A paper describes a structure:
The bovine H-protein is a monomeric protein of molecular weight ∼14 kDa that plays a central role in the glycine cleavage system. The lipoic acid prosthetic group, covalently bound to Lys59 of the H-protein, interacts with specific sites on the P-, T- and L-proteins. The gene for bovine H-protein was isolated from a bovine liver cDNA library, and the purified recombinant apo H-protein can be lipoylated and activated in vitro by lipoyltransferase, using lipoyl-AMP as the lipoyl donor.
In this study, we applied the high-pressure cryocooling method to crystals of bovine H-protein, and determined the X-ray crystal structure at 0.86 Å resolution. The high-pressure cryocooled crystal of bovine H-protein belonged to space group C2 with unit-cell dimensions of a = 84.73, b = 41.40, c = 43.28 Å, β = 91.57°. The differences in unit-cell dimensions were less than 0.5%, even though the crystals of bovine H-protein had a high solvent content of ∼55%. The interactions and the positions of water molecules for crystal packing were perfectly conserved between high- and ambient-pressure crystals. The final model consists of 1172 protein atoms, 300 water molecules and two glycerol molecules. Hydrogen atoms were observed as peaks in a hydrogen-omit electron density map calculated at 0.86 Å resolution, and 48.9% of the hydrogen atoms could be visualized. Multiple conformations were observed for 31 residues, and 23 residues shared multiple conformations with the ambient-pressure structure. The r.m.s. deviation for Cα atoms is 0.12 Å, and the r.m.s. deviation for all atoms was 0.61 Å. In the high-pressure cryocooling structure, 196 of 300 water molecules were in common with water molecules in the ambient-pressure structure, and the r.m.s. deviation was 0.48 Å. We observed no significant differences in structural comparisons at ultra-high resolution, and there seemed to be no artificial structural variation resulting from the high-pressure cryocooling.
Author numbering: 1 to 125
The structure:
């Protein structure tokens, strides 16, 4: 019952068969100020690894890939008017989507926060 990460610098938290997905601090730094969030429709089916949207900044687009197989249940409506929540609160108020997840074994494939710490330390050295 802890946050896990992807090698593309996304995160997911889980409770009750529902995952909440966002981007890590490393990811939001790499983008700079987010100007637009392209998010999926509620009810969209996703496979793990499937594209679900994109973030835009002056610097780049960043394509979003699902960390889990399942079905979108919520998108963060605050990001239409306040996309910069992704930078100011990437783990909390700047969450992107929530989804039910159909294959719990998939979490075992993701990175623990300890592994993600080691990952970004090695990248940044």
């Amino acid at each position: 019952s802890v946050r896990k990460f992807t090698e593309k610098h996304e995160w997911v938290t889980t409770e009750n068969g529902v995952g909440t997905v966002g981007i890590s601090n490393f990811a939001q730094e790499a983008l700079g100020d987010v100007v637009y969030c392209s998010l999926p429709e509620v009810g969209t089916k996703l496979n793990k690894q499937e594209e679900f949207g994109a973030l835009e900044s002056v610097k780049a687009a960043s394509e979003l890939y699902s960390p889990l197989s399942g079905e979108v249940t919520e998108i963060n409506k605050a990001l239409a008017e306040n996309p910069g929540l992704v930078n100011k609160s990437c783990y909390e108020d700047g969450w992107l989507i929530k989804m039910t997840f159909s294959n719990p074994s998939e979490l075992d494939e993701l990175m623990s926060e300890e592994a993600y710490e080691k990952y970004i330390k090695s990248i940044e050295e």
